[PDB]
């Protein structure tokens, strides 16, 4: 059993229309930069988060 909270997620749709991956945008600062860049890949560097 687990409990739901209001969150913002970044969901990924493949070319067939199925959700294959997701990012929880408020888990980590890393996840926050993923959410901002709107990508699952981050290049080397320093990013302002929030």
């Amino acid at each position: 059993v687990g409990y739901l909270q209001p969150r913002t997620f970044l969901l990924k749709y493949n070319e067939n229309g199925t959700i294959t991956d997701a990012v929880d945008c408020a888990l980590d600062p890393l996840s926050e930069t993923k959410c901002t860049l709107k990508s699952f890949t981050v290049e080397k560097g320093i990013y302002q988060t929030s």
Partner: protein, 50 residues
């Protein structure tokens, strides 16, 4: 009854029970940055609190 600053937001208030003046401060403050070597290389990150 209320005190307002330059941005016109309320920053002081008289308590209606004890008649004492109280200051109001926001509780979100301070800049954050994240350092990553690239998601391709690793998931380890560093965080800078400015």
């Amino acid at each position: 009854q209320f005190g307002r600053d330059i941005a016109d937001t309320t920053d002081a208030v008289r308590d209606p029970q004890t008649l004492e003046i109280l200051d109001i401060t926001p509780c979100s403050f301070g800049g954050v940055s994240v350092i990553t070597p690239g998601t391709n290389t690793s998931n380890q990150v560093a965080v800078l609190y400015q």
